[PDB]
Each structure stands twice: as C-alpha cells, then as structure tokens.
Amino acid sequence: VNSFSGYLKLTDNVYIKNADIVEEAKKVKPTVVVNAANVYLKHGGGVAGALNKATNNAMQVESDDYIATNGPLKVGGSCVLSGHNLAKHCLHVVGPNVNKGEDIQLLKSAYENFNQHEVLLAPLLSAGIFGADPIHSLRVCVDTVRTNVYLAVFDKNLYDKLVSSFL
C-alpha cells in the first residue's frame, strides 16, 4: 500500500492520472520523481522547467555541478540526483527528442531506467515538447517498465485520449 490517490489502473504495475506532476510530487513526496531531462540537464521548459522552478532553481544548481564533473548524459540514459523539496530522489531520464531528430527506438532504453526503482512518479517520456506521440510513449512504458509506475498527465484532453485508446 502506498499514498498515491485517484489513479486509474492500466495494468498490474502501471497507473495513470490527470495531474500536474509538480503538485503530485509536493503532495505525495514520493521516493522517486522522474524528470524529463535532456543530456545537459538544462531544465528550461516542459516538465523539467516546471520541476526546477518548484525547487527554486536548486535542481539546476545541483545539475550544473553534476555535468561539470561527469559530462552529459546519453540519450536513453539517466542519473539519480536529489529530489529537493519534491521527493527523496529525482531520476533524470533522457528520452529521445523528436524535434532534434533523435531515434525513437531509444525510448525503450529510456524507460528501462525505471526498472532500477521499485516505485516511481513519472511523466510520459518523450511527450510534450520532446515531440513524440504520447500514445506510443504509454505503450512503450507498459511494455518495458516492470516496477510500479504512477504516470501524471498534465493535459486533461490528452489524459482522456490515452485512457480511451488504451489497449
């Protein structure tokens, strides 16, 4: 039993809700919140910009030190950093950005990072400003993640479409 509330159950391990991931994280304080990161951990917009803003830019400060030490992530890769005021940890995961021409096959590799964590609050990888089809992202999530994932979908219209079209 966990404290996530109001989710629709899609499969044994995947749950979905129309919610602002920032507000969800502040309420639940999950062990792991997933960020829709880029390889530079530059949290300018989309989910990343919103999460970073909620940390008063502390996420960006920590991220800049991480990159200065380690260099950029790989597309499809991840790193674990602090969750600041939002969660215990933030798993920064880089899905392919279609608006940069990146290979959509890397979306499965991106979701594999979730399997290193028993429970996560997450957005749909590569959705929104990353330019992928969110219906496809949900399919890859369900077919790749085996741990317990609670998906927050900001757009109510998109949420209804994802549920109504889910196979």
Ligand X SMILES: CC(C)(C)[C@H]1CCCN1c1ncnc2[nH]ccc12
- Taking the complex as a whole, the smallest distance from the CB of residue 9 to ligand X amounts, in Å, to 19
Q: What are phi and psi of 80, to 5 degrees?
A: -100, 125
Which residue number, 39 or 70, has a Cβ lying nearer to ligand X? Answer: 39
Which residue number, 81 or 132, has a Cβ lying nearer to ligand X? Answer: 132
Which residue number, 68 or 130, has a Cβ lying nearer to ligand X? Answer: 130
- Taking the complex as a whole, the smallest distance from the CB of residue 18 to ligand X amounts, in Å, to 9
Give the separation between CA 133 and CA 153, rounded to whole angstroms: 13
- Taking the complex as a whole, the smallest distance from the CB of residue 167 to ligand X amounts, in Å, to 20
Which residues here bind ligand X, judged by CB under 6 A?
20-22, 46-47, 50, 123, 127-129, 134, 152-155, 158
- Taking the complex as a whole, the smallest distance from the CB of residue 46 to ligand X amounts, in Å, to 4
86, 33 Cβ separation under 8 angstroms? yes
Of the candidates 40, 34, 112, the residue with the CA atom closest to the CA atom of residue 73: 40
Q: What are phi and psi of 59, to 5 degrees?
A: -60, -45
Which residue number, 41 or 152, has a Cβ lying nearer to ligand X? Answer: 152
Q: What are phi and psi of 89, to 5 degrees?
A: -130, 155
Which residue number, 20 or 112, has a Cβ lying nearer to ligand X? Answer: 20
**Nearest residue (beta carbon) to ligand X:** 128
- Taking the complex as a whole, the smallest distance from the CB of residue 72 to ligand X amounts, in Å, to 21
If one counts every other C-beta atom within 10 angstroms of the C-beta of residue 138, the result is: 23
Q: What are phi and psi of 117, to 5 degrees?
A: -135, 130
